[PDB]
Design a protein around this nucleic acid. Structure first.
Lengths: 107, 86, 130, 49, 93, 45, 95, 93
DNA sequence: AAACGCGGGGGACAGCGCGTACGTGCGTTTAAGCGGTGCTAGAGCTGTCTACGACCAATTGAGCGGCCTCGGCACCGGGATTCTCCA
DNA sequence: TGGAGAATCCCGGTGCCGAGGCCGCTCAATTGGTCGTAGACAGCTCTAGCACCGCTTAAACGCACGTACGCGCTGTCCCCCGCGTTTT
């Protein structure tokens, strides 16, 4: 019947039947066990909350209510486990964290 | 009724083993600061594989270790090695 | 062989000389004590007077001292254990375990008092046993 | 508590019988044991030599 | 031409998480890329496990195994629980 | 990061499982069991 | 007798003239049971999984000692110091 | 159980190429470890390309691109030849 | 083997020298980039289309597991060789 | 620049287990028919990359130079390994 999206059944924003549709689409298995899309959309919303947390943190730390990729750089690259997990992910218009080498500092 | 659990054979891996491998790795005067500076860092290598590899075992519903999941983990880490099937 | 401190009288001082700074050291140092381990449950257990199925089959059919107990004669105890019921076997097991643990605590308590009486003399300048 | 502190000082009078060992060896709140130890060392009787 | 994206969904988790902070569409695009990025990462890892043990029913047990494997530290154990959490909300519903 | 997820599902407390042990740094006390024997000696020299 | 220093390099010949590992093996198998039994016990330990990692260890370590002396001789030393190793592992991305 | 072993075909290539020299079964196990490993490297790359073309077909052009992007120098170009040429032999037979 | 030592002499290290280099400042443009055109190109969108291997039926020998060697190379005995350290 | 000696390389005798093939016996790999459908491929459109110059002007560049640091040179001491040890 209607598109009554399966995220509301899971308390989610990410429609778990779009996720089940994508898992049937992604050739991961023949049967897509119907909790695997909920596991996916659930880890998805957990990490969406994880990063939107630090994103709004760094954005209002720069006194802006608009979260920008520079804020994404300064929030993500300050993290141990995130930047340890994302050592090879680059953020365009993220730039650098402000930091100088220690002996290049004049005395 | 005997519990066989081992711990830190990395000193049973001798410091003469470092005086071997440092020459195999091209070191002349291995200072005393080096020999155990080695023995920690490789142990960082050691658990991290099996931390995933034991993770292979239980979803596989097993109580043994194969080199199959060693290969799963090493290739999973980008440590591709031949001699083992594939 | 009556204490369990660090017997080297130069590592205990170097431990405090760095402890006031707030630094660890190489060797270890425990607090002083006496030796001896009070190891229970690797010792006398609750005995197994029941069989592997002597309770569920009883459920279907609707049923001088060695350590702390004196050794009974062969004929007198046999008619006594021809009297009891498997409602009281679980009582008897725990009664005999309560005797065994009490004796195994009494003798170790006596040895422990004999050790502490020599600890307090040693830590007060008396040599021993005076 | 008082007999414990006085008996424990007089085994080795060259040692300052601290509050922390008295707190670690008898069961009670630290405030009352601290006040009793400071009263006791106020009148001699412990840590006098 | 309504084409399913995650811009209003990242907006949903935004106003679920930082309603005090609006977004740039650049950060929105970074996250919309990131969604399908790890959606492919973990599920290709899961198909890798589904070929490790030659399985054709990837359930949330298998995504649990992938979350166990790939993610470092709490990122595993949280996505262990959180990935179970709405699973327990959907296996109920 | 545990508390980072208490807020997400809480939008929609002491840990009684971690029971700590009691190790104590030894007081510098001569007579008492549990303390190191630094400082003034038992003999008066 | 002799001086400090001389007989290293023929070892650097011979070890690299040869193909083997340079490590104790009963500590190797006991270390494998050691580390794999720490995560989940009761593993019945095939020696395949035991020996399957030693090439992945020792050769990379050997490669690390070359980078160690690379930072040591770039800083102009052969008494190699862990400053060289960790600067290498930094530029290796390990450190 | 007919397990598709790669000792005999690689050994056919050895008796074609270095036939004076045998091969140790440690080395033959290196080859047998090489075979499906390499057979799936470019295969996963190529299915990624098949969705870069968004195609449910894959032709030898797709393997040609898998050769084209990736392999260093003439190892590409000979396999640009060879990968096509035996295709040119298979389109001849 | 490990393992424990142990001269022992030069390698690390400090440290001093020296001199130049590399920024720094500022003069000098200058091409950077911006607008601003003019346009058109292939991207893009549709528009059908058929062929293509799918898929599955039949088959069949492939090829490889289990079954037969015997020999390439390791092991070792002995000697020749060849690098190194003190004359 | 040279011999003594310790390590190495090389060469002769042994033998073996692994490399390779042998012997079925499938089973997978093929051929044989679809099968619409996938992408094959025609048309359409429109756009979106296209250079281009007007022009600025500050960035780049042009150069004076000043000294800092990087190395020039040393002595050391140290320190780590080598020779000898055995046990583990």
């Amino acid at each position: 019947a209607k598109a009554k999206t399966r995220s509301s059944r899971a308390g989610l924003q990410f429609p778990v039947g779009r996720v089940h549709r994508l898992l049937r689409k992604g050739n991961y298995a023949e049967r897509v066990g119907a909790g695997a899309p909920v596991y996916l959309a659930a880890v998805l919303e957990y990490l969406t909350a994880e990063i939107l947390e630090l994103a709004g943190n760094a954005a209002r730390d720069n006194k802006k209510t608009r979260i920008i990729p520079r804020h994404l750089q300064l929030a993500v690259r300050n993290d141990e486990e995130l930047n340890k997990l994302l050592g090879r992910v680059t953020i365009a218009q993220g730039g650098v964290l402000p930091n100088i080498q220690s002996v290049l500092l004049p005395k | 009724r005997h519990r066989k659990v081992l711990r830190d054979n990395i000193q049973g891996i001798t410091k003469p083993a470092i005086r071997r491998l440092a020459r195999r790795g091209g070191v002349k005067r291995i200072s005393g600061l080096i020999y155990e500076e080695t023995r920690g860092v490789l142990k960082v290598f050691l658990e991290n594989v099996i931390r995933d590899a034991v993770t292979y075992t239980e979803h596989a519903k097993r109580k043994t270790v194969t080199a199959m999941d060693v290969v799963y983990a090493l290739k999973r880490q980008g440590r591709t090695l031949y001699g083992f099937g594939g | 062989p009556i204490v369990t401190e660090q017997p080297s009288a130069e590592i205990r001082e170097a431990y405090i000389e760095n402890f006031a700074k707030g630094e660890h050291i190489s060797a270890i140092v425990p607090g002083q004590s006496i030796s001896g381990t009070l190891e229970l449950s690797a010792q006398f257990r609750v005995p197994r007077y029941h069989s592997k199925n002597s309770f569920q089959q009883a459920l279907q059919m609707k049923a001088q001292y060695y350590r702390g107990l004196p050794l009974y004669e062969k004929n007198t105890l046999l008619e006594r254990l021809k009297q009891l019921t498997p409602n009281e076997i679980k009582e008897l097991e725990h009664l005999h375990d309560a005797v065994f643990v009490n004796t195994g605590l009494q003798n170790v308590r006596k040895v422990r008092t004999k050790k502490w009486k020599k600890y307090w003399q040693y830590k007060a300048g008396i040599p021993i046993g005076l | 508590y008082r007999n414990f502190m006085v008996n424990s000082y007089r085994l080795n009078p060259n040692e300052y019988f601290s509050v922390t060992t008295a707190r670690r060896n008898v069961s009670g709140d630290a405030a009352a044991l601290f006040r009793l130890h400071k009263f006791l060392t106020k009148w001699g009787l412990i840590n006098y030599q | 031409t309504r084409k399913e994206s995650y811009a209003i969904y990242v907006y949903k988790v935004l106003k679920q998480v930082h309603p005090d902070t609006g977004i740039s569409s650049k950060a929105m695009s970074i996250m919309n890329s990131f969604v399908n990025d790890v959606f492919e990462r973990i599920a290709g890892e899961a198909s890798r496990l589904a070929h490790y043990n030659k399985r054709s029913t990837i359930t949330s047990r298998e995504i649990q195994t992938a979350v166990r494997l790939l993610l470092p530290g709490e990122l595993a154990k949280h996505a262990v629980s959180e990935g179970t959490k709405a699973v327990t909300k959907y296996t109920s519903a | 990061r545990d508390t980072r997820r208490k807020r997400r599902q809480g939008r929609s407390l002491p840990d009684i499982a971690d029971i700590p042990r009691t190790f104590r740094t030894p007081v510098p006390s001569t007579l008492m069991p549990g303390g190191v024997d630094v400082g003034p000696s038992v003999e008066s020299y | 007798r002799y001086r400090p220093g001389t007989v290293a390099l023929r070892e650097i010949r011979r070890y690299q003239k040869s193909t083997e590992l340079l490590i104790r093996k009963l500590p190797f198998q006991r270390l494998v049971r050691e580390i794999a039994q720490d995560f989940k016990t009761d593993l019945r330990f095939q020696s395949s999984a035991v020996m399957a990692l030693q090439e992945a260890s020792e050769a990379y370590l050997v490669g690390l000692f070359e980078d160690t002396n690379l930072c040591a001789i770039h800083a102009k030393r052969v008494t190699i110091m862990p400053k060289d190793i960790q600067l290498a592992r930094r530029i290796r991305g390990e450190r």
